[model samples]
Target: HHHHFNLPPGNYKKPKLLYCSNGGHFLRILPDGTVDGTRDRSDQHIQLQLSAESVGEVYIKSTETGQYLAMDTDGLLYGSQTPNEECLWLERLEENHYNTYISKKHAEKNWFVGLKKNGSCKRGPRTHYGQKAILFLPLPV
Candidate 1:
């Protein structure tokens, strides 16, 4: 399945499953899997839409510090709220990667924009205890 999609200047359409953009806005994906949205650096909220049968989450992570956002099929959004109370924003730079921006005033002092890539994990059953399963464990713990 191809993930990278872009749209022309005109002939507008709507997306069925959208994702995060480098400028901190949600890029809507049309029924044909084409991106149809744009945003400036100031936008922070990431939105996504999907079919009712779609399962799992659409994960976005900053390659800089690893902060991220996760949106489920139900359109509910989830993310990390660190002690500093900083929020993550998507910064578009290159293909399949976005820079992470901190919204907290104090934290933003040290927070320059940094790039990140889309994150994912398999959705299935597990049977082994010591096996290297990709569970959502806290980082650097």
Candidate 2:
């Protein structure tokens, strides 16, 4: 094995699988802009495109759909046509070595991107901090 380190300032984005701890699933963004969790194998659909455009913040996007992930005021995950504040997610490395992403658009209500045990989404008002549903692990290849 060999290792080399260099800097490519422009290509800051790298894709990874966002695995939900509670649902035992990986997050996927549909072409129709639907966001959900998948309880199956590690498929490309679960390979969510990730980036850090701002300090300590992250963006979840699907290059296949050409859309960015965001949440409604009610905490429903949706895709955005533009990369605005709505698509920005506040990241926090939480317990058990997982992280949570809170939509900047819905952070006022503390909406966490959560998944149910059956791989379904939980609305913002229903989600809370430190819940296993909202915790995720970004697995890099």
Instruction: Mark the 10 consecutive residues where model 2 has the least summed lDDT.
Output: 1-10
Task: List, residue by residue over 1-141, the lDDT tens digit for candidate 1.
Answer: 211122112111221212333232333222332222333322222233221111211233332233343322222223432212222322212322322222222232323222112222212121111222211111110
Candidate 1 runs further than 4 Å off: 1-38, 42-59, 72-75, 81-141
Displacement of residue 102 (Cα, Å) in model 2 is 1.1
Worst 10 residues of 1 by lDDT: 132-141
lDDT of candidate 2 over 25-70, digit per residue (tens):
8887877778888876555567667788765477887756768888
> What clash pairs does model 2 have?
none
Please report how far candidate 1 places residue 110 from its true position, in Å.
Answer: 39
Let me know the TM-score candidate 1 reaches against the reference structure. 0.19
**lDDT for residue 1 in candidate 2, whole number 0-100:** 8
What are the models' TM-scores?
A: 0.19, 0.83
